[PDB]
Write a protein that binds this ligand. Structure first.
Ligand SMILES: Nc1ncnc2c1ncn2[C@@H]1O[C@H](COP(=O)(O)OP(=O)(O)OP(=O)(O)O)[C@@H](O)[C@H]1O
Ligand SMILES: Nc1ncnc2c1ncn2[C@@H]1O[C@H](COP(=O)(O)OP(=O)(O)OP(=O)(O)O)[C@@H](O)[C@H]1O
Lengths: 400, 305, 412
């Protein structure tokens, strides 16, 4: 896919210059205080989202962005006739110049943005989005709970930290709960459709065995024990009873059709178990990644679907009772999940409120979900970057 | 840089509840991770590297072993951490024959030593080297090259040990890495003879001192036991020396069919990255543990964590 | 004075208990995620401030707090006939008791003259002397909080920010008492003014005493050089920005002496007067210079300093750059501002308090984390510092003062 490979900054804030070279899988940016880590993340997020109207609020001279496929974007801020003009130049030669004051007026109002998105959609610059995790995730999550959430939180955060700040669009824990519920409902409906298919399929499978001529019952017993003791079933979970009836009628009653019917029944049980496992594959992988961190609780679902945290006494609690660090762990693992939106994950200070035993495993458990996405983190903590020192990037900007 | 100091890391040991292992380099971390994951793929041991720990002392800055010894000394008695160092030439006797005074893994309050000179000495079992080189080969004349290499490997270890001892006598450890080239090696009827090439980029004084030390140490190494001899070879030196010896044997036995093809394959093998060789050897070494009784590993260290 | 010494929690959120024993100087509290560190800090901050009306918003059974002097506070939440009640019991037998619904109604009306409940709580905590020591609370969310405050505060007038933070994080959160850098700047200006007035009083007293001793005692080469060095040192100080004419007076005295016993006594009392003035200048500016030396050990390309000028009459306090430029303290970054506040809170200029800092490693580089606790303790305030941290770079070198928190989960 398309990944950021180079960012050059010239006279940004009229203060410094900075050229950064990236990897395509993982980048761990680090540097001193005020070195421009957060500004680099903001520039990357605004470029990747195609939100060039943010650049009216940044004082700079030239920003060069290079992607993986060779696409190059050059953004310039010229000053002519005591007016500032933003110039965006692609590698195709197509360009768009718009006035700063018009962009400021559209900001005060919230036409030019329509021209901008037509230019972006024409040149396919929104092929991959960017999930921006700011350094103030905790108070923003607490504020928003007291895409509309993205819009309101973006307005409030740009009110506080300036209008250059990108659109906040990382998955909040309430969004995580809603998407988990939607995936659980879809998995149940998929199980319903698969059962209706295998229902009509097994009738002609049995009908085929009527025209053709021990341990199988034990294997069916094992499959029925596994399915009856499965949390993914809440309804018609009495396979042990019908298995006992079947084995009683077998011991009461050698025809080859009986053995073929036993084969069909074993295949139907294991096939239903296989589709039931593949329907809940992403949810179980995400909850296994989360529950590898939590100590005295376990995130789990139960059936109407309930999604919460089981404690060792069996009591349930909502996701709102989690602490700040545990909620941040939930969000950062969901952004790298397969059920999360495919994007470029930009995290600013992922080490906030995380114990060092979790900081050592955060990047490992994000990369072990095989999302294939590019992850860029800016950290001050050496325990985040341990084990991945080949991907560390040290930025030392040249101040003027 | 973004790394812990000695005191900060000691505090991290107090705060963290994981089972930890401290090793010298990052390559040691990757190899030991494969070793641990063979016995327990779900193991939760976290391995730290002393290479990524800043030291305030200038002398201790690039002395990885001294960092490990300092840390081990200051938390001596902790339960959750184990230490591994490189034995180097410690506990070896050079009284006209190579003698190992330990012949076992060293242990001193969660501080362990590799059985050989370093961690890479575990790779010097002949079966591991064979399997790994066969797997990582140009695939042109592999079978005959492996058969010849399997014949040469018994006596070549004496040559490698002599090279390492000659390097440490004149303190020019990195000298054999750039001095000896695979073309200089000659494949005889089971033996090898690194001819002193007349032309070398390095000064003749270093070359002459190296060959004087090599000649003065070779009969002593010959009289020593092969098993003891295979463990004293320096870890980084041995890998490259085997790479050159295999490039030489491949070109020696494949030039008659096609000299250019053999030379291209030999140069290709010689141009292979060290990291590629270490990873291939590590995979072969992991697979041979438990199959052959002649493959060693730090069993005490694995048991302790 | 009075310092906290033991906190015993019982069934917080009906599931876990905790028992922590503290030290009187420094307590670096660390633990796993979700252990109950921030809840412990909230409990200490509510108890020490005497804001017991917060405890109607926590689900618990019993919380005991022991101080260093022996005063024990026992807070018990009971449920009598489905009606919940908070009972606060001290060690001398004095106690108060109120309803949870009344407290919730009072807090909601405060969201919309104090109530009967607020007046009763304040009377109870005032008559029992429960508010000797304050508690500076540095929250974990302070970095965005000061950004919110700078778009629309003090250690005493912080009602709006505390109300907003309790709106975001629930009503159990204590009041936001940590000093803003504006409060630090104002306090620095006031301390400089007080130091100048004390210097003026010392000048008058030393002038009268020196004239009396001179006139009574009235009826060499090394002394002139020593007095020359003292006058040079007096002239080369920032504190003498209102008067820098010591060398001219020394040269006039030296020229009167050099052209031609009784003069030796005048010379040695002149040297003693210069030494006494220099020592009173160090004493009067001791806390300010110590605090600025603690702060300027962290800042790289700038230094915090004060300035006087005779043309104006307002001592200038702010940042000084090596190129001579002056900027106020608001042009600092977030981490440098955190350093400024966390070093003023442990200073002698700050109020007598118990410094409760939650996550001091927020927005700090790894070089600054290794020196924060050393520079807080080097000011010798005698405070009790309680930090809840996840960073080993903060806590390094203080492993004897580290307290692990492991709550005990109860099943019911
Ligand atoms: N208008 C401005 N907006 C943002 N930063 C600015 C501006 N003018 C100058 N700067 C400088 O840019 C740096 C702040 O940028 P940024 O937030 O990316 O830095 P950082 O290294 O991530 O910071 P920190 O470690 O404090 O979080 C500081 O050096 C600051 O002095
Ligand atoms: N309303 C609540 N109901 C139940 N449990 C709660 C509630 N609020 C908090 N908890 C529990 O208390 C703990 C949160 O407390 P606190 O924030 O003090 O923890 P912490 O150890 O400081 O966390 P962190 O890792 O965020 O620093 C978690 O175990 C959480 O499950």
């Amino acid at each position: 896919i398309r990944t950021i490979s180079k960012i050059e900054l010239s006279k940004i804030h009229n203060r410094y210059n900075l050229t950064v070279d990236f990897f395509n899988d993982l980048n761990v940016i680090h540097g001193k205080n005020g070195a421009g880590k957060s500004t680099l993340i903001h520039v990357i997020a605004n470029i990747v989202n195609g939100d060039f109207i943010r650049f009216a609020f940044l004082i700079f001279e030239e920003i060069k962005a290079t992607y993986s496929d060779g696409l190059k974007i050059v953004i310039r801020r010229d000053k002519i006739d005591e007016q500032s003009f933003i110039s965006v130049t692609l590698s195709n030669g197509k360009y768009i110049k718009f006035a700063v004051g018009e962009a400021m007026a559209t900001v005060r109002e919230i036409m030019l943005a329509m021209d901008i998105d037509k230019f972006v959609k024409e040149n396919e610059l929104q092929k991959v989005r960017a999930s921006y995790f700011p350094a103030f995730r905790t108070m923003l999550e607490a504020w928003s709970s007291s895409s509309f959430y993205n819009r309101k939180a973006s307005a409030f955060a740009r009110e506080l930290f300036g209008q250059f700040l990108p659109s906040i669009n990382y998955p909040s824990p309430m969004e995580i709960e809603d998407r988990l519920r939607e995936e659980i409902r879809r998995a149940q409906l998929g199980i319903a459709a698969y059962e209706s298919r295998t229902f009509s399929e097994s009738f002609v499978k049995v009908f085929s065995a009527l025209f053709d001529n021990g341990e199988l019952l034990k294997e069916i017993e094992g499959l029925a024990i596994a399915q009856d003791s499965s949390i993914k079933n809440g309804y018609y979970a009495e396979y042990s009873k019908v298995y006992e009836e079947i084995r009683s009628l077998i011991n009461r009653n050698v025809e080859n059709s009986v053995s073929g019917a036993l084969v069909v029944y074993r295949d139907a049980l294991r096939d239903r178990q296989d589709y039931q496992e593949k329907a809940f594959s992403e949810i179980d992988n995400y909850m296994s990644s989360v529950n590898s961190f939590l100590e005295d609780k376990e995130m789990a679902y139960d059936f109407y679907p309930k999604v919460g945290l089981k404690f060792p006494d069996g009591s349930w609690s909502p996701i709102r009772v989690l602490s700040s660090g545990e909620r941040q762990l939930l969000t950062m693992l969901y952004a790298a999940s397969k059920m999360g939106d495919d994007a470029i994950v930009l995290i600013d200070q992922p080490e906030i409120s995380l114990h060092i035993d979790w900081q050592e495993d955060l990047l490992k458990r994000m990369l072990s979900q095989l999302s294939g996405r590019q992850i860029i983190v800016c950290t001050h903590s050496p325990s985040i970057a341990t084990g991945y020192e080949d991907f560390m990037i040290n930025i030392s900007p040249e101040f003027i | 840089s973004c790394a812990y100091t000695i005191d900060s890391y000691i505090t991290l040991l107090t705060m963290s509840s994981k089972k930890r292992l401290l090793v010298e380099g990052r390559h040691d971390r990757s190899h030991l991770y494969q070793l641990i994951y063979k016995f327990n793929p779900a193991s939760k041991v976290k391995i730290d590297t002393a290479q990524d720990i800043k030291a305030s002392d200038k002398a201790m800055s690039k002395n990885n072993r001294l960092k490990i010894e300092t840390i081990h000394s200051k938390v001596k008695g902790k339960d959750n951490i184990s230490f591994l160092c490189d034995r180097a030439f410690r506990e070896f006797a050079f009284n006209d024959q190579i003698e190992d005074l330990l012949n076992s893994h060293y242990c001193d309050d969660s501080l362990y030593w590799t059985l050989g000179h370093s961690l890479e000495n575990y790779f010097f079992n002949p079966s591991i080297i064979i399997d790994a080189f066969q797997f990582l080969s140009p695939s042109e004349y592999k079978y005959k090259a492996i058969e010849l290499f399997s014949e040469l490997i018994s006596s070549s270890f004496a040559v490698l040990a002599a090279v390492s001892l000659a390097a440490k006598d004149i303190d020019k450890a990195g000298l054999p890495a750039a001095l000896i080239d695979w073309k200089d090696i000659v494949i005889n009827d089971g033996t090898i003879k690194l001819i002193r090439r007349d032309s070398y980029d390095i000064d003749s004084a270093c070359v002459d001192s190296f060959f004087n030390a090599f000649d003065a140490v070779l009969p002593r190494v010959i009289a020593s036991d092969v098993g003891i001899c295979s463990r004293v070879v320096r870890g980084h030196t041995g890998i490259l020396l085997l790479q050159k010896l295999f490039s030489a044997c491949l070109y020696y036995v494949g030039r008659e069919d096609d000299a250019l093809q053999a030379d291209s394959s030999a140069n290709y093998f010689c141009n292979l990255s060290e990291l590629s060789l270490t990873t291939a050897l590590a995979e072969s070494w992991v697979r041979k543990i438990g199959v052959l009784e002649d493959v060693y590993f730090p069993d005490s260290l694995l048991k302790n964590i």
